[PDB]
Ligand binder design. Sequence first.
Ligand SMILES: Cc1ccc(C(=O)NC2CC2)cc1-c1ccn2c(C(C)(C)C)nnc2c1
Length: 349
Amino acid sequence: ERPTFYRQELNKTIWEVPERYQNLSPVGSGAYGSVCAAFDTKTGLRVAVKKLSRPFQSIIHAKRTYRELRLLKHMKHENVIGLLDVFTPARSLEEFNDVYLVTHLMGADLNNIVKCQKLTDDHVQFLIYQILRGLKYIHSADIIHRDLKPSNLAVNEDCELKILDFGLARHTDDEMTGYVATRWYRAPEIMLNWMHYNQTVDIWSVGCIMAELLTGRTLFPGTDHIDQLKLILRLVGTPGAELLKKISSESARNYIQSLTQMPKMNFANVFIGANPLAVDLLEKMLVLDSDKRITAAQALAHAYFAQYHDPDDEPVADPYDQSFESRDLLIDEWKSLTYDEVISFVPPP
Ligand SMILES: Cc1ccc(C(=O)NC2CC2)cc1-c1ccn2c(C(C)(C)C)nnc2c1
């Protein structure tokens, strides 16, 4: 009872997918893999199907395919994308060469819904509640998103949200360059490599996202890493002695110490007219010192989310074994591990 596969030409590439998936149509390539929307006739869901992609052409590609599949199989939370299905047209490990991952398709991304557009306060509470609820879960598994931004927040018509692309974060020097949304939401310590960083890199990005939902404008649209740092330091202040010490990169501590000291601005004068509770929570997320930033779990308990908070309905993850991250294997070994993961996949209920 291996399903029946059929073949389509799409992206100018062959898709070979089980007959359960019908009406495939492109919703974009990437480098990465191609994504298609599809109707899953078995679940009644609209789904996103990602074909990787030369998955085992280098060690870097093989480890990455294994990582993504492992991450997706782990995640079981309403506000985190998980795996609905994984499949290969291949019948043996020897023939194994393509992986397709299937995922709920919420509908759009947040970026395409909200940008240039200011949201109502109740709409903001809901979206950020769900981002922190799914981040509490991800972080509890010891996973860092590292690249949270509106384009990887999948949102449906009812403003319900799942987080995409956690744990992968492997951008080139060039995708991060100049006046680009790829960098606007990243934590200063990660943008400028100040230190080996914690999970609160992600709470900095929620803060950037939240401020943009409230105001309709990017919070730190820097034209480059240094311009963006200056936008940052102008709002939150230059570091103190105490943070300067923790900046293990000697090079970066020397640069930042060159800067004219500036105090933290008043967030109620930047976020004029906003819910005081929204402003308070922004001041707790946008703290420069990552050791002092609010965590997803503490933030969910904040008064801003009184309507939505239910401490009994904010679950945590079973633990995630990333011991494989510090293992060097050969192509065929990553590939065989990936295959074991493809074949033991048990669909959700
Ligand atoms: C198919 C797929 C596979 C894995 C991951 C993924 O997140 N992998 C990393 C966590 C390990 C994301 C998607 C995916 C891709 C685009 N999507 C959209 C658009 C088309 C609206 C952007 N909405 N939902 C999605 C979901």
